[PDB]
Amino acid sequence: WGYDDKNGPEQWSKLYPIANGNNQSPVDIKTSETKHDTSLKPISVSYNPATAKEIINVGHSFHVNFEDNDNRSVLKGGPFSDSYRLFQFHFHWGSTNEHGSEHTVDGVKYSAELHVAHWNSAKYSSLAEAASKADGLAVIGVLMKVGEANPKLQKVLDALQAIKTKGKRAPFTNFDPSTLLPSSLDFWTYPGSLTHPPLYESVTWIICKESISVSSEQLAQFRSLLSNVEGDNAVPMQHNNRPTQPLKGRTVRASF
Numbered sequence: 001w002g003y004d005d006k007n008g009p010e011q012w013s014k015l016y017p018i019a020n021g022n023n024q025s026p027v028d029i030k031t032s033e034t035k036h037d038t039s040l041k042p043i044s045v046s047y048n049p050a051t052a053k054e055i056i057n058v059g060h061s062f063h064v065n066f067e068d069n070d071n072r073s074v075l076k077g078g079p080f081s082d083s084y085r086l087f088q089f090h091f092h093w094g095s096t097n098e099h100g101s102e103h104t105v106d107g108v109k110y111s112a113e114l115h116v117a118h119w120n121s122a123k124y125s126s127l128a129e130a131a132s133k134a135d136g137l138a139v140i141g142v143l144m145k146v147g148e149a150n151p152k153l154q155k156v157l158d159a160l161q162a163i164k165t166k167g168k169r170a171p172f173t174n175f176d177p178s179t180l181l182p183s184s185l186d187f188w189t190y191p192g193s194l195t196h197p198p199l200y201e202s203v204t205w206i207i208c209k210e211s212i213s214v215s216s217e218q219l220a221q222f223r224s225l226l227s228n229v230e231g232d233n234a235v236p237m238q239h240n241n242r243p244t245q246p247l248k249g250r251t252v253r254a255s256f
């Protein structure tokens with residue numbers, strides 16, 4: 001599996017039949033059809049920077065991992081009744097600076113997208129277990145619009161120099177991912193899935209209404225990592241976004 005012609009999104013079904021499921025992500029959010037739900041509570045994030053652990057190149061992308069052995073960093077509120085433990089944040093981008101998000105809004109594709117993932121620690125024993133359950137994961141997706149440079153990304157960009165090829169990892173500490181969210185946390189939520197294999201339909205999506213910025217040169221930096229192991233010929237991490245999937249009867253609720 002990858003994002004190329006040969007093993008990209010259009011082929012994934014050949015291997016993960018769930019790819020053609022009824023709860024696949026991302027989806028296009030048609031704002032004229034979302035449903036206002038008055039039961040939705042404000043999302044509340046309480047992250048501890050001491051939980052930041054490492055940054056790693058996984059080939060198709062890079063992940064920032066957190067210690068998830070306790071409830072030091074959690075997500076609460078929104079559609080939830082239990083708290084979700086923060087385990088990772090990562091990005092999605094495309095081959096062009098203009099079109100690279102996963103989710104679309106009124107058929108408009110953004111430049112990139114941030115995913116802040118958490119697992120249901122109230123109901124499950126570990127992410128492994130939680131990852132395939134319907135209520136296992138909660139992911140906040142934040143849409144990024146190409147424009148002004150965002151100084152909040154700097155620590156992440158700097159870290160990149162050290163995880164240039166596949167399989168490299170570097171300590172990454174004292175960092176609060178909440179510094180990356182927009183100022184207002186109004187949102188849309190829908191039942192969905194992982195946006196790449198294994199594609200489990202285990203995610204409760206929290207899409208921020210407000211987007212954050214990023215510049216061309218910042219995106220170019222993501223695009224500069226390599227999918228190859230060190231010493232092999234260079235193959236750039238050109239894009240890692242999946243096309244939107246049919247809603248198939250699902251409802252997108254808005255907290256506003």
Ligand code: AUC
Pocket residue numbers: 115117127131139194195
């Ligand atoms: N986005 C997001 Au995930 C785990 N496993």
Ligand SMILES: [Zn+2]
Pocket residue numbers: 090091092115195
């Ligand atoms: Zn993602």
